[PDB]
Design a binder for these strands. Structure first.
Ligand SMILES: [Ca+2]
Length: 579
DNA sequence: GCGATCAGCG
DNA sequence: ACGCTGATCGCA
């Protein structure tokens, strides 16, 4: 019902300087995934191409990598990475519908063209599930069905750029798309394609150690419990702890006894079995997620893993890492921190460089809340986490153990993000009256922060949404709900999203200024990972001197707040040695 | 499929 | 009864 040409060859009218391009990659993980079809819509008409034909034509390949040939797409990173696995570059992406919908409303959950088209009353295009099917029924259709679906998606992108750019401009989000998210999309594509090398031999050795350590801990659990049970079974573990051993019931989930880590920590004076169960899970978490799971996704010929950086998923504008997740690699426990030793540079005589912001959200909060004392604290380069560990535990700066500091990290972010005296009393294991007094003293030192959190909830109730420093937006319809639980979670989202989202916008602008700077200096250094507030790079060891002077200044100068930004950097032979 | 749990980021 | 994620696993 839509006219298009099924082009056998590549012609000149298909190579206009403005076009809507669709490079379809049906598989979820687009790394090394087959391209099933190509569709182009421009001023001259609508065209469908077969990938074996076009991707071997020199004029079509030159048209893809020509930055002066502007292309409108949906999810340009998916196509760009799949083309990189085919030796083909893709430049000139002037509009990405996927990221344009993500800025307008992040909760819409837009994952295909049809969902984004519905936001603008465009429905002349089928959802991808209706074309390819669900799960075990997933199948690329017959060429006439596939060719029309790809052309209808291209025609939809062709018609939706203008109305999407109009609403972005009213939301003050148009420069957020064109100057931040779309340039970031190209950088993330190179990071995903570059991959991160893994020492498969060392990981395989840890797995054999964890295999025989897990049995020893598992046998002591059976010794202390007096019988065998599925340690991962909540029913039997609940029977062992709160029926057999008759331990106190401190928490009940919707399904039964709660055996979470915070609960088992409080049962430590009562029995020695809860401390080994804790150790068993930690060894089990490392074994399943980071040993077996990591070796599953490694590419054997290159010993590199290729993550997918999801740019249009989080509600605050953060990134996320999938298959594998390289943003929750262990670090706090020494047994699990060794796994970071397996992450190595991709070439000999290369090293890993890693820089990160120091308490970025509290500094963003100081700027936005305009609090006198909080801005003074960071103008002195104070360590609020250590300074809070002194006030809590009555110790001095010398006696602040990294455990007392990480616990003060929770109090600092918890208090500013609406923790109650109940929740504070459970984390500090203090009386509920002391925790309430501590929160009163905390807001006496920072009255402007308390004033800001009241204003940001009142502004959310008025506007219906909250914004970040670069005008990223999150709607909060529940902020006016009649239910107390539903409204309170919305109020704490209004306190947190502008702060966490403004930190995401700063690290994103830093990535863009970093690659433009690395290009100017003509360095072979390139980014590998982003962990929210940390940037990880690899580079030849000779470039390390320049990077120690370049990366900190680039990150510190990404934005200009009423307080300075601080960046700490390290380099070394592995990711482990890079912090 | 989902909830409990836990790894990370603030 | 601070916020934002992804992976694993048992299933009450
Ligand atoms: Ca940090």
């Amino acid at each position: 019902k839509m006219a298009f040409t099924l082009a056998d060859r590549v012609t000149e009218e298909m190579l206009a300087d403005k076009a809507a391009l669709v490079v379809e990659v049906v598989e979820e993980n687009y790394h090394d995934a087959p391209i099933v079809g190509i569709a182009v819509v421009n001023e001259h008409g609508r065209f469908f191409l077969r990938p074996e034909t076009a991707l071997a034509d020199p004029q079509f390949v030159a048209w893809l990598g020509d930055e002066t040939k502007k292309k409108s797409m949906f999810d340009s990173k998916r196509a760009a990475v799949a083309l990189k696995w085919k030796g083909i570059e893709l430049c000139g992406v002037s509009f990405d519908l996927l990221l344009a919908a993500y800025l307008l409303d992040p909760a819409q959950g837009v994952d295909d063209v049809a969902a984004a088209a519905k936001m603008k009353q465009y429905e002349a295009v089928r959802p991808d599930e209706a074309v390819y099917g669900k799960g075990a029924k997933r199948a690329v259709p017959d060429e006439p069905v596939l060719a029309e679906h790809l052309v209808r998606k291209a025609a939809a992108i062709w018609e939706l750029e203008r109305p999407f750019l109009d609403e972005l401009r009213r939301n003050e989000q148009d420069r957020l798309l064109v100057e931040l998210e779309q340039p970031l999309s190209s950088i993330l594509a190179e990071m995903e394609f570059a991959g991160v090398k893994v020492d498969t031999k060392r990981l395989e050795q840890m797995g054999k150690e964890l295999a025989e350590q897990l049995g020893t801990v598992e046998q002591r659990i059976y010794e202390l419990a007096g019988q065998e049970f599925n340690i991962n079974s909540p029913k039997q573990l609940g029977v062992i702890l709160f029926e057999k051993l008759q331990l106190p019931v401190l928490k009940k989930t919707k399904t039964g006894y709660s055996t979470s880590a915070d609960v088992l920590e409080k049962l430590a004076p009562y029995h020695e079995i809860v401390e080994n169960i804790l150790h068993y899970r930690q060894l089990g978490k490392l074994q399943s997620t980071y040993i077996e799971g990591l070796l599953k996704v490694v590419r054997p010929a290159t010993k590199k893993v290729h993550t997918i950086f999801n740019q249009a998923l989080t509600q605050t504008g953060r990134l996320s890492s999938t298959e594998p997740n390289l943003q929750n690699i262990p670090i706090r426990l020494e047994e699990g921190r060794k796994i970071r030793q397996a992450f190595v540079p991709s070439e000999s005589d290369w090293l890993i460089f890693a820089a990160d912001y120091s308490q970025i959200e509290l500094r963003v909060l100081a700027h936005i809340a305009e609090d006198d004392n909080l801005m003074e604290a960071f103008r002195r380069d104070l360590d609020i986490h250590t300074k809070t560990a002194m006030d809590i535990f009555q110790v001095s700066e010398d006696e602040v153990t990294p455990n007392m500091r990480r616990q003060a990290k929770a109090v600092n972010y918890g208090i500013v993000y609406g923790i109650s005296d109940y929740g504070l009393a459970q984390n500090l294991n203090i009386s509920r009256k002391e925790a309430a007094e501590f929160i009163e003293r905390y807001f006496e030192s920072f009255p402007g922060v308390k004033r800001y959190m009241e204003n940001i909830v009142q502004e959310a109730k008025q506007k219906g949404y909250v914004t970040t420093l670069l005008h990223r937006r999150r709607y909060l319809p529940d902020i006016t709900s009649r239910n107390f639980n539903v409204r309170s979670f919305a109020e704490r989202m209004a306190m947190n999203t502008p702060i966490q989202g403004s930190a995401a916008d700063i690290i994103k602008k830093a990535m863009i200024d970093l690659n433009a700077r690395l290009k100017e200096e003509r360095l072979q250094a390139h980014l590998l990972l982003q962990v929210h507030d940390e940037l990880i790079l690899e580079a030849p060891k000779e470039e390390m001197e320049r990077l120690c002077r370049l990366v900190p200044e680039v990150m510190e100068q990404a934005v200009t707040l009423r307080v300075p930004l601080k960046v700490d950097y390290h380099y070394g032979s592995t990711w482990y040695d890079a912090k």
